[PDB]
Ligand binder design. Structure first.
Ligand SMILES: OC[C@H]1O[C@H](O[C@H]2[C@H](O)[C@@H](O)[C@@H](O)O[C@@H]2CO)[C@H](O)[C@@H](O)[C@@H]1O
Length: 453
């Protein structure tokens, strides 16, 4: 409410360093700033966004924000040109949706190969030598590589290496009908990983926590993680280097590059309080450093502080894997891409389906669920569950998109409920709700539009 900014950020980031920026904002303003890191906040936000229980500011990679923006869930970001010139232009590209800036870019993230120099002074240049490397390391009682296999964010670089892609980009924007998840490149990539499991070089149940504790206790020679993981490795007794990810079939693995961004809730009563903290407190040299001290940000978007961080060879390696990778689209159809790839990798890793059944299933489901967003606002009110039931698409990854779209539609009805009570609300979500509620909603919609002038 008024007199407080509640901020949502994921738990693997420096929320205590971010809180320290919230203290300094309170010493000058008296305004209290609370930072919390809820479980599944990226899925919890579309549930409580337009309600009085949503955050004022939400921190996540830029790929989740276009679904928020298209729903009208976030207020438009309009900094002065003098403030925009303080950040790199490509960071603003990642937060521009339909010509509108929708968030504040914070830092550039990219996965890197992190290795123990004591167990491995020269890291492998190719994926293909980890099998032979692991055998020599399992004789030593250890393993070669352990990383999170439960999230496709970590496994996508190998899948993308030989030619996999999410949505084909061609001349200005992406084609959601062109998904490259089961092409010859993505199959060879996922086959190599599955080959590592069946050959006893990796465990299919390895997650983030096990892979981190194994590397930080010297049990595996390598892991794959981002800049946020460096702080936990510093505290342990391992001398580590970070460098390029291995190549596959002679081509560099292409990770999905995420730009950590801060979006402002369109239903927040303290939008101006949020921009002042963001523009004049966090996005400063001493604000970024308070967070980077907690757990590192990576290549920050602030050009002044990025001069100091570019010295770090760990930052240079992050940028090298980011140029070899590709930036994530911010389109709402990314949620459909992820949900379908998570199931394909887990099913192929556990052997429940072959690499071919897994990647062909995800290809059709990701291309089918992508079209649901094109009619999310068209389906008339009270009819979304009826619409879903009629289609009969009973696939887990497709209905995960149906549920989120249903969550998006509910928040637009909350925005209309507040807007009718002269409360803070996003006008785009108000109109999106009104334009699916019959002829009287379209009269109330346009009548409103005509008084705005
Ligand atoms: O897994 C940790 C890592 O996850 C994030 O990457 C996400 C992506 O941003 C989401 O849209 C999700 O659907 O897909 C990926 C997970 O599979 C962040 O990019 C990163 O900061 C975070 O550490």
């Amino acid at each position: 409410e008024e007199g407080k900014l509640v901020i949502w950020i994921n738990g693997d980031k420096g929320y205590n360093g971010l809180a320290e920026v919230g203290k300094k904002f309170e010493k000058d303003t008296g305004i209290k700033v609370t930072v919390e890191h809820p479980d599944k906040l990226e899925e919890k936000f579309p549930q409580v966004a337009a309600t009085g229980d949503g955050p004022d500011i939400i921190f996540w990679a830029h790929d989740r924000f276009g679904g928020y923006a298209q729903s009208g869930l976030l207020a438009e970001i309009t900094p002065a040109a003098a403030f925009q010139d303080k950040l790199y232009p490509f960071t603003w590209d990642a937060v521009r949706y339909n010509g509108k800036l929708i968030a504040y870019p914070i830092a550039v993230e990219a996965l890197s190969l992190i290795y123990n120099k004591d167990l491995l002074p020269n890291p492998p240049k190719t994926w293909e030598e980890i099998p032979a490397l692991d055998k020599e390391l399992k004789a030593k009682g250890k393993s070669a590589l352990m990383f999170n296999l439960q999230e496709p964010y970590f496994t996508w670089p190998l899948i993308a290496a030989d030619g996999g892609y999410a949505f084909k980009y061609a001349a200005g924007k992406y084609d959601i009908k062109d998904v490259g998840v089961d092409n010859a490149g993505a199959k060879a990539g996922l086959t190599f990983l599955v080959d590592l499991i069946k050959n006893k070089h990796m465990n299919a149940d390895t997650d983030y926590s096990i892979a981190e504790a194994a590397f930080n206790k010297g049990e595996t020679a390598m892991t794959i993680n981002g800049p946020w993981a460096w702080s936990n490795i510093d505290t342990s007794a391992v001398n580590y280097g970070v460098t390029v990810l291995p190549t596959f079939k002679g081509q560099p693995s292409k990770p999905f590059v995420g730009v950590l961004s801060a979006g402002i809730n369109a239903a927040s009563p303290n939008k101006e309080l949020a921009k002042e903290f963001l523009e004049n407190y966090l996005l400063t040299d001493e604000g970024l450093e308070a967070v980077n001290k907690d757990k590192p940000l990576g290549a920050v978007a602030l050009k002044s502080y990025e001069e100091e961080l570019a010295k770090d060879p760990r930052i240079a390696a992050t940028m090298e894997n980011a140029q070899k990778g590709e930036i994530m689209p911010n389109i709402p159809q990314m949620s459909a891409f992820w949900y379908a790839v998570r199931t394909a990798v887990i099913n192929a890793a556990s052997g429940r389906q072959t690499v071919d059944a897994a990647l062909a299933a995800a290809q059709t489901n990701a291309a089918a669920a992508a079209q649901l967003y094109d009619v999310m606002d068209a389906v008339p009110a009270r009819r979304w569950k009826e619409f879903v039931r009629t289609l009969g698409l009973r696939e887990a990854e497709i209905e995960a998109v149906e549920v989120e779209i249903g969550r998006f539609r509910d928040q637009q009805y909350e925005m209309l409920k507040r807007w009718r009570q002269q409360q803070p609300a996003g006008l785009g979500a108000v109109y999106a709700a009104l334009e699916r509620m019959g002829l009287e909603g379209c009269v109330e919609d346009l009548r409103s539009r005509l008084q705005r002038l």
